[model samples]
Target: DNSRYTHFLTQHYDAKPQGRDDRYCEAIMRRRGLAAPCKDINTFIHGNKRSIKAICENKNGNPHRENLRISKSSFQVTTCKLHGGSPWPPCQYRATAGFRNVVVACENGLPVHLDQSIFR
Candidate 1:
């Protein structure tokens, strides 16, 4: 049951930030219901590690990559709410932003999970 609705968890939810900054954190938190002093907020966009052929084929009759990249593809994000000036919590997380080999599990023509990719 939970898995069926998991599609939304990977969505960018109209919160696309240019990079790691106050603006980025602000956008993500505000939209995602992550309240806070925003202690160590971090987010990273991921790209496919597939061969060009596979990638192009995936794009066939599908939405454009860039559009999907921001709104659909999975992201690696870490954020925590701070308390007492320590890494305790309102929900402790570290701040960061960047891109890397982002692994996503796709099944039945949609994204399933945002995981680290294994080398072939």
Candidate 2:
């Protein structure tokens, strides 16, 4: 089904950039209900869903692979890297923003996995 695509949206989509803050990552993680046992890292893309979906449309007819696709344009994203934390709560993250091409895995014409965001 499209559960993976839904999960990808839940985990990565952020319509606006919240900017860097000391507690931003923790707050977002908690808000997304992913902080109970805290995730070590997560990236948020600041853009609309339509633009992201376009990357996987494979309009050019040449892909890196059957499912992986790279965006034609770079996007603004925040990479939250955990600096200190246990397997559980009280996690800390160092959030950094950058503009890069997003790499994703597509299935059924939707993005299902964020492979990576790279500079080119």
Candidate 3:
């Protein structure tokens, strides 16, 4: 699966832009992927509090930390491809705890690639 996707999708999903905002589309993907932070996650509260608390512990471990991006990278990649765009800021930092800047490239008025690099 990785090989089929690696060559066709793209290998240029890399970039860093200014500002700090997590990609909003990723939130949608989280909800879809069953890893959302809300109680409604997975149609059960089990994946809600438990997951949040666990992630909180990780972020709090650092003295200068605030919030942590809980969504997984798999969700980001899935969303990016579906929308025919790459996750903006190509790096996972923005998708997780940085800033929101989900960008994508389009072909013939349709998204062909998505990457946060556009905001730069």
Candidate 4:
């Protein structure tokens, strides 16, 4: 329930980025209440019976992700959008991060919270 924001941080607002610098996390963290530069963040996820195990076996491993857990979830979630230009001191985000084989703990009935996302 409340951990929805935590999930978003893991997937969308992940502080780590490619290349030199963008301050994306700084904006995202501040707006999202994550403490900029994000030295710490946490989320709790249970295991699922998805085929990522086999999927990984198929490709040997996905270059981007690991410990893949696929699950369907419907829950209360807050959305965030980013404002201001990129590569600037005031990079900002206006909140958010999904579902399918089904994790029992994460399922809920809340509708999807729409967010005007950025930083593609």
- What C-alpha lDDT do the candidate models reach, one value each? 0.38, 0.76, 0.27, 0.31
Across 80-101, the per-residue lDDT of candidate 2 in tens digits comes to 7777748677777778788877
Q: How do the residues 1-120 of candidate 4 rate in per-residue lDDT, one tens digit apiece?
A: 646534533433332233212344344455544443332322212232132222223222222223332223332222334455443334354333222221211223211121222112
Poorest stretch of ten by lDDT in candidate 4? 110-119
Order of models, best TM-score first: 2, 1, 4, 3
Which of candidates 1 and 3 is the stronger one according to TM-score? 1
How do the residues 1-120 of candidate 3 rate in per-residue lDDT, one tens digit apiece?
234223213322222322213454334335334232221111111112222223223331211213212322111121222232333322221233222223333232222332333233
Point out where model 1 deviates above 4 Å. Answer: 1-16, 34-93, 116-120
Measured by lDDT, the strongest candidate is 2
Q: Which residue pairs overlap in candidate 1's backbone?
A: 80-93
Better of 3 and 4 by lDDT: 4
Candidate that would win on TM-score: 2
Displacement of the residue 119 alpha carbon in candidate 3, Å: 5.1
Q: Mind sharing the TM-score for model 4?
A: 0.26
Candidate 4, residue 36: how far the Cα is off, in Å: 4.6
Question: How would you encode candidate 1's per-residue C-alpha lDDT over 6-53 as one tens digit per residue?
Answer: 443433222344455545555555456554444333333434333211
After aligning candidate 4 to the native by TM-score, how far in Å is the CA of 34 from where it should be? 5.0
